[PDB]
Design an enzyme around this catalytic site. Structure first.
Site, short mmCIF file in Angstrom:
data_model
loop_
_atom_site.label_atom_id
_atom_site.label_comp_id
_atom_site.label_asym_id
_atom_site.label_seq_id
_atom_site.Cartn_x
_atom_site.Cartn_y
_atom_site.Cartn_z
N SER B 201 0.82 -1.25 0.05
CA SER B 201 0.22 -0.07 -0.12
C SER B 201 0.92 1.27 0.16
CB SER B 201 -1.06 -0.05 1.24
OG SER B 201 -2.01 1.08 1.43
N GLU B 329 -9.03 -5.37 -4.97
CA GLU B 329 -8.18 -4.13 -4.30
C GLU B 329 -9.14 -3.11 -3.70
OE1 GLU B 329 -5.41 -3.60 -3.39
OE2 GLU B 329 -4.02 -5.21 -4.56
N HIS B 442 -7.71 -5.83 0.14
CA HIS B 442 -6.54 -4.97 0.21
C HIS B 442 -5.61 -5.40 1.63
CE1 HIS B 442 -3.82 -1.65 -0.60
NE2 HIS B 442 -4.21 -1.46 0.70
#
Ligand SMILES: *[C@@H]1O[C@H](CO[C@@H]2O[C@@H](C)[C@@H](O)[C@@H](O)[C@@H]2O)[C@@H](O[C@@H]2O[C@H](CO)[C@@H](O)[C@H](O)[C@H]2NC(C)=O)[C@H](O)[C@H]1NC(C)=O
Ligand SMILES: *[C@@H]1O[C@H](CO[C@@H]2O[C@@H](C)[C@@H](O)[C@@H](O)[C@@H]2O)[C@@H](O[C@@H]2O[C@H](CO)[C@@H](O)[C@H](O)[C@H]2NC(C)=O)[C@H](O)[C@H]1NC(C)=O
Ligand code: NAG
Ligand code: UCY
Lengths: 537, 536
Positions: B201, B329, B442
């Site tokens: 990330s 995601e 995610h």
């Protein structure tokens, strides 16, 4: 001495026709009926004047002259282009229509099919072999009418606001013929209360403009739009662009001896030999293009009080049945007329660079940004350079932009606002087709089946295709007399109405009807919903 | 008496470590090593300063404080959010790093993995359970380093041009730890000439920025970017918008305002840290998901141009990169502001909610741009089907923020000299506490890369353990050689990603399968067309 079936009195005088042999039996034909005064000389570019009554008997026994028009020379002798070229002498004296009726004449009023040919508003004729009305009238016992209407500068050159060249006179030719049908079709056994317009390409766009023009809408009841729509990017032009094209045409032929007085400018154009105008017709287009024509209907407030888009969106269409459709490969014909790398004589396996160049030819006169959006949607980004895929993608671009998505928008708005709509895709590649295999089912090649041409013994169709042609003629005639192509014959399957949500249409080929969803829904959302927002920003 | 393996001398002085158990044997860990002077008081917002030497023995047996940050309260006590929240006390005195090493310590140079945590540049900590280095070091015999770096306003508030709040100091915190690695990792058995950076990330965005900043580029040798990229719409901010956000924060906490940066920073330096945190979300210009207030700023210094510009202009010969994304995601962020979404129902949204969601997931774009998004992500045969609308809005958020920024980075590095390996991670953890409709969200590949399934006190399946061992081996293969492939055939082999073939592998319990295109159709929209539209 005389045969009474071949003798008919219409409002203007007496006519005499011929008895036509058809595979199924006799038909009566009245070919070359004058419905307007000849628009020669001082009458060039002017609205049609109705034919003055005559004494004695007019012989309506053969097709009359083709309206003056450009003649395609790209593949001389090739049947796939010659079939659309004039098959009569070219003349400005061309405002004649044709009536086909059963023999003997129907006893009770019979529904009327009126045909309007295409040809980009620059060409065509009611006399072409593929528009032969004898087979429909025999097979389905309707009355069939077709008319000639002026094309090119003679039908559609406009100096808007001017009185000596108001534009749209070719559409006025069509409306005059429709008024003749109202006043006279009963003399032939036809029902003036059951009149179905049908036409193909520019003829389909013309049908739609009569739907959207109130003075025309009282003259018919149902409509069939094959492979065209009034709202296509090629079918109309704005007032200023019409004036620019008219003025540049005049300039290219010596008038005035640019612009000035509209009266003096037209009067000069009227002294030029018809063929001199035709020789410069293509030079007034603003760019390199395909599927673009110089003189087309003009949106000027008269015939069309607003753009076809606006009138479609605003209209109340309750009580109207329409049948609309497209062929499988609407885009392929036009690529060989200017898209780089394309030929009917090789496989037209273009490069990426030729594809990007073709996009500007087939979507002419839009911003670089707008062109980028077209490339985004039609590139397959896992195979951005495969030549076979690029060829089909450019065909889809031209086909979707000019025909499929305009038809789909028309179909969707009419359904949502009160009309019963039926939609098809025509998917049979005729055994006799002379275009190459990569072009698929090209634009214009459903007409011969609708008109029953495979029943002509002189031709070499298969027996399946004869059965197929008979099937289509029934759908068309069923729609003509009931507003519904279906026949009380449930297995057949059934052809369901098209609606904005379900978006159902049927495939027309040798196999039985198959229902499907969406007229290229994903593609047409780009053309109909997003791209307009982009071009005003 | 005392254990020699857990005594280490670094350039600053002496450390005492601790032995850790794993189901594969012990490892040595040095936790809470100071690498900077505490950035406190007058040094809030300034670049980090190297830790001055100490006498005696620093106790490195326990994680140190978490850098001051917002604490998620959306779902109190819910494991799916709590696992990312601080698990030690907050403090601005937080610039510590951690070294895990084999036991007994290697006596030959061992490859080094450096972890940079994510957390939107507003949160995160090297002490989170899911970042425990013990399993990788035991299983794959590497040295693993992770550091704390300042987040939120403390790490990324910028008054561009000003010496008092220059911006990017959290990035400088990271660079200083990479320098510390160069100077000290050999004392632990690590090889400073074989440093692989990896992060997820905002950590992956951080990795990419060190790639594109020359003073960082000599501090490591390869990069792993998981579910993030420096060119993502959220990872950087322009100088003007950074100044506006810093200025509104000063207003919100009682500071001014002929104007003056020196005075505004000075007044911020008097506020308790928690006060800045309490107003951090309120400087964003609109309602949004996947946007964060204080991120790296492009000012010509740390980054001499935008990351997209620097990517395009770079010679990346000699670079090996491992990049990838999870299968979904976008799903995680939807429950933080998309209308109609909750982890507690099926989030079967309506068309009207979908359209409103688009302006939340793609904030700060023109109405035309939003319409172009709706065109692409609508199935016009099913424009109002709620399940398809939920999936489509997840795709909008995931493509725009992660998948397509990663695809562009991968494509251009590969076409400009780098050897790239791409993956999509498609395994939903048996232990996952988010609902089924969120898929593989995610961040939920991290626990498998760190081999957390090997921890017996946790509830992973036997086949999940084998999977973690596979992933640890790929990652460690990549750090040692620049190639994840097990140098041995069946396999299938993991082929390199290229701009044309666009090949990547899927990572789940099944053997490697090769596929083509990181959502090539959608990413053409975000990477090729939408920039042109926003220009004109
Ligand atoms: C496919 O044909 C086009 C058209 O070229 C014409 O038709 C051919 C079948 C053949 O008769 C040629 O001699 C004709 O020129 C080709 O495109 C043309 O390429 C030439 C140069 O090679 C160029 O001068 C023309 O401008 C091109 N025409 C167009 C419309 O772009 C095309 O290269 C052929 N594709 C092949 C061979 O794969
Ligand atoms: C799915 O959940 C969202 C979120 O609703 C919240 O969480 C639920 C678990 C429940 O406790 C709700 O009462 C909470 O408000 C729902 O979206 C909300 O809907 C309410 C009215 O029902 C509305 O006032 C809020 O504005 C909505 N919140 C958002 C962020 O849009 C949604 O209705 C649920 N879907 C269902 C029930 O089908
Ligand atoms: C001699 C001649 O041609 N006169 C005409 C005139 O009748 C007309 O009113 C005018 C319109 O602008 O154009 C000129
Ligand atoms: C937006 P990226 O930094 O994701 C963060 C938030 C780690 C994480 C919690 C998954």
């Amino acid at each position: 001495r005389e045969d009474a079936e071949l003798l008919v009195t219409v409002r203007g005088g007496r006519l005499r026709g011929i008895r036509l042999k058809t595979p199924g039996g006799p038909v009566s034909a009245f070919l070359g009926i004058p419905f307007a005064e000849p628009p020669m000389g001082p009458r060039r570019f002017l609205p049609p004047e109705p034919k003055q009554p005559w004494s004695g008997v007019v012989d309506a026994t053969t097709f009359q002259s083709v309206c003056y028009q450009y003649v395609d020379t790209l593949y001389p002798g090739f049947e796939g282009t010659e079939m659309w070229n004039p098959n009569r002498e070219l003349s400005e004296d061309c405002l004649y229509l044709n009536v086909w009726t059963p023999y003997p004449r129907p006893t009770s009023p019979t529904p009327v099919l009126v045909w309007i040919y295409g040809g980009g508003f620059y060409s065509g004729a009611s006399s072409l072999d593929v528009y032969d009305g004898r087979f429909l009238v025999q097979a389905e016992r309707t009355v069939l009418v077709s008319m000639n209407y002026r094309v090119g500068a003679f039908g559609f050159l406009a100096l808007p606001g001017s009185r000596e060249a108001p534009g749209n006179v070719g559409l006025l030719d069509q409306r005059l013929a429709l008024q003749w049908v109202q006043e006279n079709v009963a003399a032939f056994g036809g029902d003036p209360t059951s009149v179905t317009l049908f036409g193909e390409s520019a003829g389909a766009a013309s049908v739609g403009m009569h739907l959207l023009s109130p003075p025309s809408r009282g003259l018919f009841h149902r409509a069939v739009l094959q492979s065209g729509a009034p709202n296509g990017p090629w079918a109309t032009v704005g007032m200023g662009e019409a004036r620019r094209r008219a003025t540049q045409l005049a300039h290219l032929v010596g008038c005035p001896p640019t612009g000035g007085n509209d009266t003096e400018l037209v009067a000069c154009l009227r002294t030029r030999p018809a063929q001199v105008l035709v020789n410069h017709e293509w030079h007034v287009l603003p760019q390199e293009s395909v599927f673009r024509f110089s003189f087309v209907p003009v949106v000027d407030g008269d015939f069309l009080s607003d753009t076809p888009e606006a009138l479609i969106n605003a209209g109340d269409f309750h009580g109207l049945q329409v049948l609309v459709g497209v062929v499988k490969d609407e885009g392929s014909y036009f690529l060989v007329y200017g898209a780089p790398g394309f030929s009917k004589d090789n496989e037209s396996l273009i490069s990426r660079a030729e594809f990007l160049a073709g996009v500007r030819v087939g979507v002419p006169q839009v911003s670089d940004l707008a062109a980028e959006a077209v490339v985004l949607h039609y590139t397959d980004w896992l195979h951005p350079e495969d030549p076979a895929r690029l060829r089909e993608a450019l065909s889809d671009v031209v086909g979707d932009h000019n025909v499929v998505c305009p038809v789909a928008q028309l179909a969707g708005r009419l359904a949502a606002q009160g009309a019963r709509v039926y939609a098809y895709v025509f998917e049979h590649r005729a055994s006799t087709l002379s275009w190459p295999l990569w072009m698929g089912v090209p634009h214009g090649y459903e007409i011969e089946f609708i008109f029953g041409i495979p029943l002509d013994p002189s031709r070499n169709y298969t027996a399946e295709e004869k059965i197929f042609a008979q099937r289509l003629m029934r759908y068309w005639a069923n729609f003509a007399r009931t507003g519904d192509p279906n026949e009380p014959r449930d297995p057949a399957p059934q052809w369901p109405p098209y609606t904005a949500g379900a978006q159902q249409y049927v495939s027309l080929d040798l196999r039985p009807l198959e229902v499907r969803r969406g007229l290229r829904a994903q593609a047409c959302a780009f053309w109909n919903r997003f791209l307009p927002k982009l071009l005003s920003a």
